[PDB]
Design an enzyme around this catalytic site. Structure first.
Site, mmCIF file in Angstrom:
data_model
loop_
_atom_site.group_PDB
_atom_site.id
_atom_site.type_symbol
_atom_site.label_atom_id
_atom_site.label_comp_id
_atom_site.label_asym_id
_atom_site.label_seq_id
_atom_site.Cartn_x
_atom_site.Cartn_y
_atom_site.Cartn_z
ATOM 1 N N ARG A 269 0.824 -1.204 0.000
ATOM 2 C CA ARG A 269 0.000 0.000 0.000
ATOM 3 C C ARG A 269 0.860 1.258 0.000
ATOM 4 O O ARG A 269 0.656 2.162 -0.817
ATOM 5 C CB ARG A 269 -0.940 -0.018 1.206
ATOM 6 C CG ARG A 269 -1.901 1.152 1.266
ATOM 7 C CD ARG A 269 -2.795 1.055 2.488
ATOM 8 N NE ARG A 269 -3.555 2.280 2.703
ATOM 9 C CZ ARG A 269 -4.310 2.514 3.767
ATOM 10 N NH1 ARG A 269 -4.434 1.622 4.736
ATOM 11 N NH2 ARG A 269 -4.954 3.673 3.864
ATOM 12 N N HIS B 243 -2.617 15.826 12.339
ATOM 13 C CA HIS B 243 -3.630 15.109 11.575
ATOM 14 C C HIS B 243 -4.801 14.681 12.444
ATOM 15 O O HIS B 243 -5.955 14.770 12.021
ATOM 16 C CB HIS B 243 -3.015 13.879 10.906
ATOM 17 C CG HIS B 243 -4.022 12.939 10.316
ATOM 18 N ND1 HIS B 243 -4.679 13.196 9.132
ATOM 19 C CD2 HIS B 243 -4.492 11.747 10.752
ATOM 20 C CE1 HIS B 243 -5.507 12.203 8.863
ATOM 21 N NE2 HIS B 243 -5.413 11.310 9.831
ATOM 22 N N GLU B 244 -4.531 14.220 13.662
ATOM 23 C CA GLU B 244 -5.606 13.892 14.586
ATOM 24 C C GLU B 244 -6.263 15.151 15.131
ATOM 25 O O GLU B 244 -7.488 15.195 15.282
ATOM 26 C CB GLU B 244 -5.067 13.009 15.714
ATOM 27 C CG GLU B 244 -4.535 11.677 15.218
ATOM 28 C CD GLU B 244 -5.585 10.858 14.489
ATOM 29 O OE1 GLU B 244 -6.768 10.911 14.888
ATOM 30 O OE2 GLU B 244 -5.232 10.161 13.518
ATOM 31 N N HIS C 130 -8.695 -3.850 5.441
ATOM 32 C CA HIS C 130 -9.958 -3.238 5.040
ATOM 33 C C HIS C 130 -10.848 -4.222 4.291
ATOM 34 O O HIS C 130 -12.069 -4.226 4.477
ATOM 35 C CB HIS C 130 -9.691 -2.000 4.185
ATOM 36 C CG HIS C 130 -8.977 -0.906 4.917
ATOM 37 N ND1 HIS C 130 -7.656 -1.003 5.298
ATOM 38 C CD2 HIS C 130 -9.403 0.306 5.342
ATOM 39 C CE1 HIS C 130 -7.298 0.104 5.923
ATOM 40 N NE2 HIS C 130 -8.340 0.914 5.964
HETATM 41 ZN ZN LIG Z 1 -7.429 10.212 9.952
#
Ligand SMILES: [Zn+2]
Lengths: 195, 596
Positions: free
Chosen positions: B254, B355-356, B486
């Site tokens: 990925r 980002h959080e 996922h």
């Molecule tokens: Zn996120």
């Protein structure tokens, strides 16, 4: 002997629900407005028609105090000209209201782990509540054109709903004990006069 | 009364109970994730069961109201979210069967383990084979980890995934959808606005139209990575052939971020790291979040709440509680926003605390919207808002201003291409994998891939779209895609493709409003209040308005556009087109490592 029982109403162990707001008529009061003004613990202190100054020269016929625990974000709804679920359905103030509004956060007092669902507010009402009106009716609100018959069904919801007061909510969703002081003016002996 | 008044009253009834039933479940998942115990998991399942039962039974009542009889735009979007339920349209037997299959798949994946030359080890994915995949450079050992994981997890999930497809295609068809690959594309569907209408079959058009422009950029990166891998693995990769899957720096391929040490453009020059610098200034685990907040305050976003600091596990607790340390942002509700991350103060923990803390700023913005309309405009907006903060916080200009870099720091072209190539291995190196994986599941659900060609069309696409060749031949018994987290737990994967496209549409728009004079990778929106008054015009909307309209508010266009992404990597592409002059560009599907 002439001390004003503010402590009984401002420091009660348990307040009443928003819809079932308690009214107490207090007489023979030598009121220390300074300690309320200088409490330094009231989150919201907005006074309508009276300046923040002492203004002890004027006397009033009587003073009314109302008690309830609204949510934090719902304090804005309590003022002359405001609209909302609390204002329209639970507690409405007239446009010509003369008085003082006192509010302070009540977290750790009306909140507990799990939720203090004792307090109730009126969510659905057939029409807007009149100023200074009180309603305790538990009749099922009818939204559709079908008989509710006193049971919660489709388009038939119980008007009263339970506040969810967790101790971890934000400032908006935390309990806020609010006391509203009203000023009565008419021809009377005026037992309660300012010093 | 009219249906509008009979549904507005109903939604008010729903909001009061929903705002305190989902919160109790959110205060049970948080407690379990911050203190794992035997009682907590029981409470977490009990609390969520009430909310799950409440949500579905309210959805049935909502379907009694005709949607077409509502003339209020802000009221229809709440009914649409409430009425459009899932898994409640199947038989009670099949619904029970679906959860049985959906729970075995999420169990086989976690319990998967393989045999080591030290036999009594039973290496789990993490910690375990991830360290082997992300740190080792041994051809033989990586192949064992790659094939071994797919031998155990892939083979076992194949019988369950084949029944997962048919059951999920019965729920979708009963719910008036073509396939389960059409239910997933319904998150991008707008059918109420005029001039802002987006269909479920137009996402495929835009996903395959924005990937026809990434490919010229991806070919140059793929050629450069392939050239460097030949140096690392002599006589192991054909110069014009595809890249073996186990050499991509990950279990599945990925992200190419773990191929950076092999593919450093300028090896002599070190990367810009402040891990040691922060320690020299006595930066605590809380100083990062205090500094991260100062970034959002600089652009004009609201400060974090006082209750956020007290109730958030910013630092790893000393007590021996089994804390899940996956960095996540919690939108519990009732005005309570929390971030769960055990800070181990490090540069990467300073670029993931933006980002959080960019997910909370998005959550805090639409807290005034109705409860049903409290979410991203689509599934690709919530993960893209947080990422554009990482782009601004990774620039040397931002770090230099804070004092984590010397005042006489010199930005040369050498470090400019080291940063851009470190971002390409993560941003433009995952799009062909993300696009191919979702394109495979879409056709499997649709029916273009028969039951006997699941692993034949999985590698034909990967060798064509991604440029990755099979390390070993895999027959129908294997299920390679199901080995991904996922795929095996019924999660959409087109969220991570649209997110990347939305990353730079937002980033370029904010930098244009920030009066940035120069390249788009040096842009730092910090200290600019005109890039927080235009970003917040899309944050406030939430799910109340169509994502096409929300996109135009900040970017200016109603369509997914990959042009800003190419502008960000344009300085890198020029360098990539001068380092690949003596090496072939493109891959041949014919070559396979196992042929010899
Ligand atoms: Zn996120």
């Amino acid at each position: 002997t002439n001390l004003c029982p503010f402590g009984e109403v401002f420091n009660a162990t348990r307040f009443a629900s928003v819809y079932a707001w308690n009214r107490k008529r207090i007489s023979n009061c030598v009121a220390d407005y300074s300690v309320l003004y200088n409490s330094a613990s009231f989150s919201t202190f907005k006074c309508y028609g009276v300046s923040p100054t002492k203004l002890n020269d004027l006397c009033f016929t009587n003073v009314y105090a109302d008690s309830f625990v609204i949510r934090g974000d719902e304090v804005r709804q309590i003022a002359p000209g405001q609209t909302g679920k609390i204002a329209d359905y639970n507690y409405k103030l007239p446009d010509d209201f003369t008085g003082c509004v006192i509010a302070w956060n009540s977290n750790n007092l009306d909140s507990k782990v799990g939720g203090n669902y004792n307090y109730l507010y009126r969510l659905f009402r057939k029409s807007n509540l009149k100023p200074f009106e009180r309603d305790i009716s538990t009749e099922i609100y009818q939204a559709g054109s079908t008989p509710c018959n006193g049971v919660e069904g489709f388009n038939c919801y119980f008007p009263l709903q339970s506040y969810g007061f967790q101790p971890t909510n934000g400032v908006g969703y935390q309990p806020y004990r609010v006391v509203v002081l009203s000023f009565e003016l008419l021809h009377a002996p005026a037992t309660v006069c300012g010093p | 009364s009219t249906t509008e008044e009979q549904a507005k009253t109903f939604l008010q009834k729903f909001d009061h109970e929903a705002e305190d039933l989902s919160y109790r479940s959110s205060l049970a998942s948080w407690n379990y994730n911050t203190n794992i115990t035997d009682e907590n998991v029981q409470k977490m399942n009990a609390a969520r069961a009430k909310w799950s039962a409440f949500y579905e039974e309210q959805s049935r009542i909502a379907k009694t109201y005709p949607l077409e009889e509502i003339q209020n735009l802000t009221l229809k979007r709440q009914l649409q979210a409430l009425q459009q339920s899932g898994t409640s349209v199947l038989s009670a037997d099949k619904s029970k069967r679906l959860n049985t299959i959906l729970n075995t798949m999420s169990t086989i994946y976690s319990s998967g383990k393989v045999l080591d030359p030290n036999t009594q080890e039973y290496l789990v994915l993490e910690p375990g084979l991830d360290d082997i995949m992300e740190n080792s450079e041994d051809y033989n050992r990586r192949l064992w980890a790659w094939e071994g994981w797919r031998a155990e997890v892939g083979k076992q999930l194949r019988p369950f995934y084949e029944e997962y497809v048919v059951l999920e295609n019965e729920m979708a068809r009963a719910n008036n959808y073509e396939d389960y690959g059409d239910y997933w594309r319904g998150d991008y569907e707008v059918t109420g606005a005029d001039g802002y209408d987006y269909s479920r079959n137009q996402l495929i058009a835009d996903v395959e139209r924005t990937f026809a422009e990434i490919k010229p950029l991806y070919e140059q990166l793929h050629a450069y990575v392939r050239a460097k891998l030949m140096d690392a693995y002599p006589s192991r990769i054909s110069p014009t052939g595809c890249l073996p899957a186990h050499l991509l720096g990950d279990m599945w391929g990925r992200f190419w971020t773990n191929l950076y040490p092999l593919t450093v453009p300028f090896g002599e020059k070190p990367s810009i790291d402040v891990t040691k610098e922060m320690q020299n200034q006595s930066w605590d685990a809380k100083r990062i979040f205090k500094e991260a907040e100062k970034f959002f305050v600089s652009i004009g976003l609201p400060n974090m709440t006082q209750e956020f600091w007290v109730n958030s596990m910013l630092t790893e607790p000393g007590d021996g509680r089994k804390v899940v340390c996956h960095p996540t942002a919690w939108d519990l509700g009732k005005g309570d926003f929390r971030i769960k991350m055990c800070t181990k103060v490090t540069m990467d923990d300073f670029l993931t605390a933006h980002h959080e803390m960019g997910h909370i700023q998005y959550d805090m913005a639409y807290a005034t919207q109705p409860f049903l309309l409290r979410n991203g405009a689509n599934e690709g907006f919530h993960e893209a808002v947080g990422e554009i903060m990482s782009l601004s916080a990774a620039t040397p200009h931002y770090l230099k201003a804070l004092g984590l870099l010397p005042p006489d720091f010199y930005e040369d072209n050498v470090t400019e291409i080291n940063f851009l190539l470190k971002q390409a291995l993560q941003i433009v190196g995952t799009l062909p994998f993300t696009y191919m994986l979702e394109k495979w599941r879409w056709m499997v659900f649709k029916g273009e891939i028969p039951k006997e060609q699941w692993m034949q069309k999985w590698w034909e696409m990967k060798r064509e779209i991604v440029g990755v060749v099979e390390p070993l031949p895999h027959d129908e018994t294997y299920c390679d895609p199901a080995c991904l987290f996922h795929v095996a737990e019924d999660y959409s994967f087109i969220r991570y493709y649209t997110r990347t496209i939305y990353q730079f549409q937002f980033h370029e728009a904010l930098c244009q409003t920030a009066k940035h004079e120069g390249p788009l990778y040096k842009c730092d929106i910090s200290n600019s209040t005109e890039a927080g008054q235009r970003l917040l015009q899309m944050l406030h909307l939430g799910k109340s308005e169509p994502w096409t309209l929300a996109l135009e508010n900040i970017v200016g266009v109603k369509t997914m556009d990959v042009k800003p992404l190419l502008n960000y990597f344009e300085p890198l592409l020029t360098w990539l087109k001068e380092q690949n002059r003596n090496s072939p560009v493109g891959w041949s599907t014919d070559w396979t490592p196992y042929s010899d």
